[PDB]
């Protein structure tokens, strides 16, 4: 039968009030014969009725995929309220209920360390700028790169990795042309986490 997966909001969306966080209830392996799917959302117990259901997206394995989105309040998610999604389809032995919430555990502030490129890498034409973020909890975090107000987009960030002391860490790699780095340009690693003041901090990296 159809499976159900429940996803949390994006970390940036819960930390920034100008953004809209939302929990996502994905239903996969929905048969062609029984496509209709009903959604029941429950916040901490009480039922809400403000969630929207996106149209079915036919997949490349002879099944449909239904998605329901429930916008959440920033405080409710961060304070640990529980979101429940009940999926009822005319082909399940019983409606499936899934539940997610914040991780529970004392939050810990992320330490941010910018790392210059290795001298051995200056042979190449592009150079790797590194941002180490370690010691934070929970794993919900957002990392970005900018250079004097302008977003640097050619970057990749590893997923959060559980560390030996219970906290999390990750690395973010920004790739810039070596000439920009040798020219003394200033790059910035913007990190967003609930344990930071104003949910924000940033560190700069520059040749000297």
């Amino acid at each position, epitope marked *: 039968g159809p499976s159900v997966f429940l996803f949390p909001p994006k970390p*940036k969306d819960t*930390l*920034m*009030i*100008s*953004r809209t966080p939302e929990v996502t209830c994905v239903v996969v392996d929905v048969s062609h014969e029984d496509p209709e799917v009903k959604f029941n959302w429950y916040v901490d117990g009480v039922e809400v009725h403000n969630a929207k259901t996106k149209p079915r997206e036919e997949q490349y394995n002879s099944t449909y995929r239904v998605v329901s989105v429930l916008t959440v309040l*920033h*405080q409710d998610w*961060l304070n640990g309220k529980e979101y429940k999604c009940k999926v009822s389809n005319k082909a399940l032995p019983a409606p499936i209920e899934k539940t997610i919430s914040k991780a529970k555990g004392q*939050p810990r502030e992320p330490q*941010v360390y910018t790392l210059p490129p290795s001298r051995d890498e200056l042979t190449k034409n592009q150079v790797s700028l590194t941002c180490l973020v370690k010691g934070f909890y929970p794993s919900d975090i957002a990392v970005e790169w*900018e*250079s*004097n*107000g302008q977003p640097e987009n050619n970057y990749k960030t590893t997923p959060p990795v559980l560390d030996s002391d219970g906290s999390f860490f990750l690395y973010s790699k920004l790739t810039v042309d070596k000439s920009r780095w040798q020219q*003394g340009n*200033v790059f*910035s690693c913007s990190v*967003m986490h*609930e*344990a*930071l*003041h*104003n*949910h*924000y*901090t*940033q*560190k*700069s*990296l*520059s040749l*000297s």
Partner: antibody
Amino acid sequence: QVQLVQSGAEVKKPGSSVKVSCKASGGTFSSYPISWVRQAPGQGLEWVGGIIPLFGTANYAQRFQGRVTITADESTRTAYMEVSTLRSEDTAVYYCARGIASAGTPDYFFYWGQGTLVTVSS
Amino acid sequence: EIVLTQSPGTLSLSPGERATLSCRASQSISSSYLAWYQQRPGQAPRLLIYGASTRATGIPDRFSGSGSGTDFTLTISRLEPEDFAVYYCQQYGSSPYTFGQGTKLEIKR
């Protein structure tokens, strides 16, 4: 505009505690982070801490951690800074400040209270 | 933490002359989060400039800011009498937020 009005001058003995209030009137309260900045007589400005009233999670400069508690009451639109175990080196003016952009975006200090002189005198 | 160093300590100029105030950062910082404030005696700081160069609303055009990296400057093209106070630079890109020592402008007579 927003109006930040703090409580009056305080005189305390060492070791005692003080709690300065900062009522915000005019604009929306919960979404904007309120910070506390202090200034010793004749000296410069030092950021003590801050809080976003909507989330209730304060943050502090390392030198004040374990000594300052910052809170925010949404029902009365009032931010508080409480400093326990007062030292004479805490004698300073304390300002509350915000804050044009909502929480999550880096911002400057645009609105300021009138200041609260805290004297630690025997 | 980031240390802002302001120069000079006191600046003695006459009304009508040009003023330059420097703010050296201990390390490179994004210019998008450098602010300048003015403070008169017995008053709270007033925001002059943010983003290193953008002028706050309702600030006379004689105040301008510039710089990047570790070197930022606040220039008053033509000093008015109410421009003689103390000026602070402040970064707000990373906690803790930090201020320079301040520079005092006094009237040269």
